Amino acid sequence: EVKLQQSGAELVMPGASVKMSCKASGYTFTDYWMHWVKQRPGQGLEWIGAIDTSDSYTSYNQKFKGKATLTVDESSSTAYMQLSSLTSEDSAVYYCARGLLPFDYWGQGTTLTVSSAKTTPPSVYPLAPGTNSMVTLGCLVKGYFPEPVTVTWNSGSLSSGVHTFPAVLQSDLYTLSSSVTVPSSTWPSETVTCNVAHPASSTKVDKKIVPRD
Amino acid sequence: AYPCCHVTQLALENISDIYLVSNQTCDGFSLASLNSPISRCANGLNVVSFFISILKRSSSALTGHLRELLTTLETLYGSFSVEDLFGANLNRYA
Amino acid sequence: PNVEVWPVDPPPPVNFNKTAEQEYGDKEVKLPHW
Amino acid sequence: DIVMTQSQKFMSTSVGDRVSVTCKASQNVGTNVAWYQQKPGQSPKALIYSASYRYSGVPDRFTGSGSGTDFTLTISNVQSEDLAKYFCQQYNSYPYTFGGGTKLEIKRADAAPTVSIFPPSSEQLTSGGASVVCFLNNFYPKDINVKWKIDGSERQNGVLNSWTDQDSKDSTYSMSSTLTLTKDEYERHNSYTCEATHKTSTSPIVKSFN
Amino acid sequence: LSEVKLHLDIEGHASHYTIPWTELMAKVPGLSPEALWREANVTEDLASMLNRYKLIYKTSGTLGIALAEPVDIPAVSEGSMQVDASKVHPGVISGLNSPACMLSAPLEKQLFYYIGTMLPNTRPHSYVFYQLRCHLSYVALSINGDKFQYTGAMTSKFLMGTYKRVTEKGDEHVLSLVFGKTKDLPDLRGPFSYPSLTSAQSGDYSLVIVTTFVHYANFHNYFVPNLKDMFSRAVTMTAASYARYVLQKLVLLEMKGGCREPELDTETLTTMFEVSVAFFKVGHAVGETGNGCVDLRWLAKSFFELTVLKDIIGICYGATVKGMQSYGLERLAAMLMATVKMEELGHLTTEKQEYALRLATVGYPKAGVYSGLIGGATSVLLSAYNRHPLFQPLHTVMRETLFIGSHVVLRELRLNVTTQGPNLALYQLLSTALCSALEIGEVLRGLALGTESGLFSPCYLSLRFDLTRDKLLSMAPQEATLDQAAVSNAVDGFLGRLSLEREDRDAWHLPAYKCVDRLDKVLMIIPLINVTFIISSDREVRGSALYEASTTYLSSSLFLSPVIMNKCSQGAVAGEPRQIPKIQNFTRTQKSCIFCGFALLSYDEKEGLETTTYITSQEVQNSILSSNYFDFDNLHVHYLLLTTNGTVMEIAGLY
């Protein structure tokens, strides 16, 4: 089972440099090159470069010559990419992709943020109703920075009837809300919990929506 | 014993006769017997290929006798399937 | 008047001598990337 | 550099139809073209390689065709789960360049939004903030209009909104109108309403809490 | 060193054959039945043999599509005079029009004159092939600081292109492609058979791949060849047409920054093999014709392409070619160049013009021996310039002819020495007259589509240095159907071709160039008879006079500094520049040349130079006057007349 796991987020001050690892498992790491791709939210995919594993043969073949610096460590089966002199324009999602030509597998993506603000974890607040055949609950994830967030329900075991609305940036903080719709007979008979994960601050929060007395 | 010999690791100067087996004689193995005026076991496919290449380089070997040997060795060579060499026993003999 | 090509000198004498062993050299080569 | 031109940025089709995404290369690229599917909030995933060969595990519904300059991704039997952006990539000469992406939309019958209001939480209020959340879930077409009403009067400022992409199961839309105010500003008034007009309902759907 | 009897079983009969070596080894002194016996691991257990077999990559996609071989070499023409490449004697062939053909057998003996080891002893090939020693020719090249290598070793029967990569460690990755007739392929060593190694087959030809499973995986990270298509193009095309196909790619890639720092991508590595195919197809067609004759016109066309193809691969890659030059053909071509009057070459048929120009380059390669070849190329451009409608884009037929004749001119510009300046400066002046707004528009349209219109344009060899990026963008095709980037790349490429610096093939051959102070401010040069004009925005030009046309309150300046007799002045003329006298007492109807030898420039006050015409004959002048060229409605447009006397005049109106 080929996996390319990537850190969720990386927050770095302008002008500095970032790490951006990509750990590979499930195959012989040394028998496939590693390519890096840049994507801004909603825009297209830009190919940064490629590196041959076990030879460290570096091939930066695009306009990221002085930005990107690809390295490899065979022991940890990791492939890295170093950005230098970070700018606001470099804030975007950076994918690491296994190279069979074409790109067989893709990593989950590492969102890069450059602003000077600090990492503030999210404050999650439950949305419960003040009947119908089904009840709709929610979860309010307010005041966090930077992105992304990963909202799940009942530890992923509640996947159907789930909406997670895109975050909104305000006052240098992101706000987001998630909804769930379950049969009215199930709730509150069976507990419904909301799990919010913030990779930047390394947090995993639960709230457990309860009726409001 | 066992004319279907077993190949195991003598130049071509002291060789007089060479016998080649068919594809049915040894269950698909291509074996050869080198002998001097002493019997040596050799790899069939490699030996046959050698002779085929000698004749091709020697296109002035156009005796009806040697012109038939070349075509005959190519048909013999093609009758053996290297893919029939599964993980089967390469030590069936010796 | 008119515009014409500036006259030029005639071709030199072509040398059909030289014994192919002088056109080429030694006929024996060694390929570079073996 | 070579440019992969995906002229059509959006394409809308029904559930039982077929779609054909077009990719035009600025040069001769051979059969070295790849197609990737990027569902919302996901990393791209390899669909077909060599411009016609299907990866393992992808259904027979996807097929590729083309060579040299004009390439097309053939999606035969679409489903709700196919909503995503489709990119074409050239890997025949450095720099490997991608297309502009082609968003696949899905058409379905209209739907009335299931509206629901949620008062501020006893925890958020204790935290010095007050946010009233209103969900408009599972409606179609995408065009909705929300208007709050505090004690009969409308609130203009302090309202943030967000839309989801077409659901992967029912291909519907969903929206979230979030009204954020200070604790005291929340406790001055006593009535909060979420008014949602739509093309399916001539009258606005109204919910409220006190 | 003895005899051996070979017994074997055929359908149940104990047949035996006797192979003698005393006779055979005498009849073929190159044979060594001992080194092959020692190469064949005859005492190799099946375990080691089978292990060796699994190492080599097998072609699972074992198939190929049927293809039709074209007719490349034609039948001998009626009463051809069969020449002998070894016995090349003068006056056999009389003129260009006399039918001629070179016999094939000794002609091949010169092409594959050298002899060497075709198949190395390296570790990937030692498993599959018997060591081979044959008469051969090879194309070799290296990139990435000799860390990636390629060699197209070939015979008259088959080609073998071998890639080799050095991975910054000691490891070496190898992948070899073999092309040729199936029956004529080299001799395989062990259990191998070609069908397991074939990637494309059709009739008598096949494309074989030989590499390790590991190495095939390494190359697939950056090299995914279309072995199917490469095979089709290598069969369905003719020797000349295939060589030109490869020629365009490299030429259109050299003007770009593609081959200054080549990359290990599929496109570049693919072409490396196609280059080898280009040479092989020529030698193969000659060798496969047997003991017959090859029409001379075919040789002229085919070996011209290889000659040009040999030069393009030299400036981009450090490649070498050894073994595709038959001096017998080079001589025979040289003897026929003593038949033609180079001064009036353009007066011949377009067919015989291209035929002659081809023999010229093949007959006199490595220019710098017979500089009279430029007169022939100049005569063609002049005869073509007089019949070509002014300011129009060159036609496909004319562009091809000039392209053939332009190679000779291009080589002389490489040299720092003058190489008979006068005719050379005339060629560039005519070329400058042909580079109009429509020509540039057609070249860029050909670059954006990779067609033939971009391969060559007289503007490349013109004396016009005012072509900037934003200036070409104005003349580019504005069609929305064409890729915006292909056009944007065409400009970058086009402009890259006329970089005076790091090109070496544009200037420093005229004597009126050292009279300039700043080179980057030069706009255009018109070398006339007894005078050359230096049009530039540079005030400090060491000429005889200094005219200043009314420019505007904008762009830098427009000066015309006539250099009399191509001799500079001690310093730039002092004082306010002269005024261009206007002319109104001049009628539109003229029955004689009264503008022969002059140049007629049309510039815009804001946009700069727009059109250039060199009045070379009565036909050119009549096209200027009768046509709507003179349009005075636009006040910001003027028409300057450059005289051989050194004077500049503005045409302001006619009767």
CSV table of C-alpha atoms in Angstrom, one decimal, chain D residues 39-210:
chain,number,residue,atom,x,y,z
D,39,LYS,CA,-12.3,16.1,-6.0
D,40,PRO,CA,-13.1,19.0,-3.7
D,41,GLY,CA,-10.8,19.1,-0.7
D,42,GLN,CA,-8.6,16.3,-1.9
D,43,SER,CA,-5.3,15.7,-3.6
D,44,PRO,CA,-5.3,14.9,-7.3
D,45,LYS,CA,-5.4,11.2,-8.1
D,46,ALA,CA,-4.1,9.6,-11.3
D,47,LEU,CA,-6.9,8.5,-13.6
D,48,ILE,CA,-5.3,7.5,-17.0
D,49,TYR,CA,-1.7,7.3,-18.3
D,50,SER,CA,-0.3,7.3,-21.8
D,51,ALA,CA,-3.4,9.3,-22.9
D,52,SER,CA,-5.4,6.1,-23.3
D,53,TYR,CA,-4.4,3.6,-20.6
D,54,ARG,CA,-6.5,3.2,-17.5
D,55,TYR,CA,-5.0,2.9,-14.1
D,56,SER,CA,-5.8,-0.1,-11.9
D,57,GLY,CA,-9.0,0.2,-9.8
D,58,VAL,CA,-10.5,3.1,-11.8
D,59,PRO,CA,-13.8,2.0,-13.4
D,60,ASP,CA,-14.2,1.2,-17.1
D,61,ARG,CA,-16.3,4.4,-17.3
D,62,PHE,CA,-13.1,6.5,-17.9
D,63,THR,CA,-11.2,6.1,-21.2
D,64,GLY,CA,-8.6,8.2,-23.0
D,65,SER,CA,-7.9,9.0,-26.6
D,66,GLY,CA,-5.7,11.2,-28.7
D,67,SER,CA,-2.1,11.7,-29.9
D,68,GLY,CA,0.2,14.6,-30.8
D,69,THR,CA,-1.9,17.8,-30.1
D,70,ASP,CA,-5.5,17.0,-29.4
D,71,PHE,CA,-6.4,14.9,-26.4
D,72,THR,CA,-9.7,14.0,-24.9
D,73,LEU,CA,-10.8,12.4,-21.6
D,74,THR,CA,-13.9,10.3,-22.2
D,75,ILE,CA,-16.2,9.9,-19.2
D,76,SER,CA,-19.1,7.7,-20.3
D,77,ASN,CA,-21.6,6.9,-17.5
D,78,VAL,CA,-21.4,9.9,-15.1
D,79,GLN,CA,-22.5,9.7,-11.5
D,80,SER,CA,-23.0,12.1,-8.6
D,81,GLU,CA,-19.5,11.0,-7.3
D,82,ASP,CA,-17.7,12.3,-10.4
D,83,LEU,CA,-17.9,16.0,-9.4
D,84,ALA,CA,-14.3,17.2,-9.5
D,85,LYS,CA,-11.7,19.2,-11.5
D,86,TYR,CA,-10.0,17.2,-14.3
D,87,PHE,CA,-6.4,18.3,-15.2
D,88,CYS,CA,-4.3,17.1,-18.2
D,89,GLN,CA,-0.6,16.9,-17.8
D,90,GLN,CA,2.3,16.6,-20.3
D,91,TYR,CA,5.4,14.6,-19.3
D,92,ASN,CA,7.2,14.4,-22.6
D,93,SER,CA,9.6,17.3,-22.2
D,94,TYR,CA,10.7,19.4,-19.3
D,95,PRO,CA,9.1,21.4,-17.8
D,96,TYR,CA,6.2,19.1,-17.1
D,97,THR,CA,3.2,21.4,-17.5
D,98,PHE,CA,-0.5,21.0,-16.4
D,99,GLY,CA,-3.7,22.2,-17.9
D,100,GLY,CA,-6.0,24.9,-16.5
D,101,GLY,CA,-8.4,22.4,-15.1
D,102,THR,CA,-12.0,21.6,-16.2
D,103,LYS,CA,-14.7,21.6,-13.5
D,104,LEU,CA,-17.4,19.0,-14.0
D,105,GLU,CA,-20.9,20.2,-12.9
D,106,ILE,CA,-24.0,18.0,-12.5
D,107,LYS,CA,-27.6,18.9,-13.2
D,108,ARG,CA,-30.6,17.6,-11.2
D,109,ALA,CA,-34.1,18.5,-10.2
D,110,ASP,CA,-34.6,21.6,-8.0
D,111,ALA,CA,-34.7,21.1,-4.2
D,112,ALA,CA,-36.0,23.2,-1.2
D,113,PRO,CA,-33.3,24.0,1.3
D,114,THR,CA,-33.6,22.3,4.7
D,115,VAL,CA,-33.1,25.4,7.0
D,116,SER,CA,-32.1,25.2,10.6
D,117,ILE,CA,-31.1,27.8,13.1
D,118,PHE,CA,-28.7,27.3,16.0
D,119,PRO,CA,-28.4,29.7,18.9
D,120,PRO,CA,-25.0,30.7,20.4
D,121,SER,CA,-23.5,28.1,22.7
D,122,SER,CA,-23.5,28.5,26.4
D,123,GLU,CA,-19.7,27.9,26.0
D,124,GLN,CA,-19.1,30.6,23.4
D,125,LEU,CA,-21.2,33.1,25.4
D,126,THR,CA,-19.1,32.3,28.5
D,127,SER,CA,-16.1,32.9,26.2
D,128,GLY,CA,-17.2,36.5,25.5
D,129,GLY,CA,-18.5,35.9,21.9
D,130,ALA,CA,-21.9,35.2,20.3
D,131,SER,CA,-22.4,33.6,16.9
D,132,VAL,CA,-25.7,32.7,15.4
D,133,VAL,CA,-25.4,29.9,12.8
D,134,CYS,CA,-27.9,29.1,10.1
D,135,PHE,CA,-27.7,26.1,7.8
D,136,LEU,CA,-29.3,25.9,4.3
D,137,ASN,CA,-28.7,22.3,3.3
D,138,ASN,CA,-29.4,20.2,0.2
D,139,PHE,CA,-30.9,22.7,-2.2
D,140,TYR,CA,-30.6,23.2,-6.0
D,141,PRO,CA,-30.1,25.5,-8.0
D,142,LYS,CA,-27.0,27.2,-6.4
D,143,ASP,CA,-28.7,30.6,-6.3
D,144,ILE,CA,-29.9,31.3,-2.7
D,145,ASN,CA,-30.5,34.5,-0.8
D,146,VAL,CA,-30.3,34.9,3.0
D,147,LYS,CA,-31.5,37.8,5.2
D,148,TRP,CA,-31.4,37.9,8.9
D,149,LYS,CA,-34.0,39.7,11.0
D,150,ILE,CA,-33.4,40.8,14.6
D,151,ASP,CA,-36.6,41.8,16.4
D,152,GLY,CA,-38.2,42.5,13.0
D,153,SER,CA,-35.3,44.7,11.9
D,154,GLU,CA,-32.7,43.4,9.6
D,155,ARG,CA,-29.0,43.0,10.3
D,156,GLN,CA,-26.7,44.1,7.4
D,157,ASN,CA,-23.2,43.9,8.8
D,158,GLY,CA,-21.6,41.0,10.7
D,159,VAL,CA,-22.8,38.4,8.3
D,160,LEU,CA,-20.4,35.9,6.7
D,161,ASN,CA,-21.5,33.2,4.2
D,162,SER,CA,-20.1,30.1,2.6
D,163,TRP,CA,-21.1,27.7,-0.1
D,164,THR,CA,-20.2,24.0,-0.6
D,165,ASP,CA,-19.5,22.3,-3.9
D,166,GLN,CA,-22.1,19.9,-5.3
D,167,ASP,CA,-22.6,17.0,-2.9
D,168,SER,CA,-21.0,13.8,-4.1
D,169,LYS,CA,-24.2,11.8,-3.3
D,170,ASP,CA,-27.2,14.0,-4.2
D,171,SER,CA,-25.3,16.7,-6.2
D,172,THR,CA,-27.1,19.4,-4.2
D,173,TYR,CA,-25.7,22.7,-2.7
D,174,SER,CA,-25.5,23.8,0.9
D,175,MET,CA,-24.8,27.2,2.4
D,176,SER,CA,-23.9,28.6,5.9
D,177,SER,CA,-24.9,32.1,7.0
D,178,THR,CA,-22.9,32.9,10.1
D,179,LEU,CA,-23.8,36.0,12.1
D,180,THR,CA,-21.2,37.0,14.7
D,181,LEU,CA,-21.6,39.7,17.3
D,182,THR,CA,-20.3,40.6,20.8
D,183,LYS,CA,-21.9,39.0,23.9
D,184,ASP,CA,-23.6,42.2,25.0
D,185,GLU,CA,-24.8,43.0,21.5
D,186,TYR,CA,-26.4,39.6,21.5
D,187,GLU,CA,-28.1,40.0,24.9
D,188,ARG,CA,-29.6,43.4,24.0
D,189,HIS,CA,-32.1,42.0,21.5
D,190,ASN,CA,-34.1,38.8,22.0
D,191,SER,CA,-35.3,37.6,18.5
D,192,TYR,CA,-33.1,36.3,15.7
D,193,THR,CA,-34.4,35.0,12.4
D,194,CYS,CA,-32.9,33.4,9.3
D,195,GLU,CA,-34.8,34.2,6.1
D,196,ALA,CA,-34.0,32.2,3.0
D,197,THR,CA,-35.7,32.9,-0.4
D,198,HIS,CA,-35.3,30.4,-3.2
D,199,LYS,CA,-36.6,29.7,-6.7
D,200,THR,CA,-38.5,26.7,-5.5
D,201,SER,CA,-40.5,28.7,-2.9
D,202,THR,CA,-42.2,32.0,-3.7
D,203,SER,CA,-42.4,32.7,0.1
D,204,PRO,CA,-39.2,32.8,2.2
D,205,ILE,CA,-38.5,29.9,4.5
D,206,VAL,CA,-38.3,31.2,8.0
D,207,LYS,CA,-36.9,29.8,11.3
D,208,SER,CA,-36.3,31.7,14.5
D,209,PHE,CA,-35.2,31.3,18.1
D,210,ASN,CA,-35.6,33.5,21.2
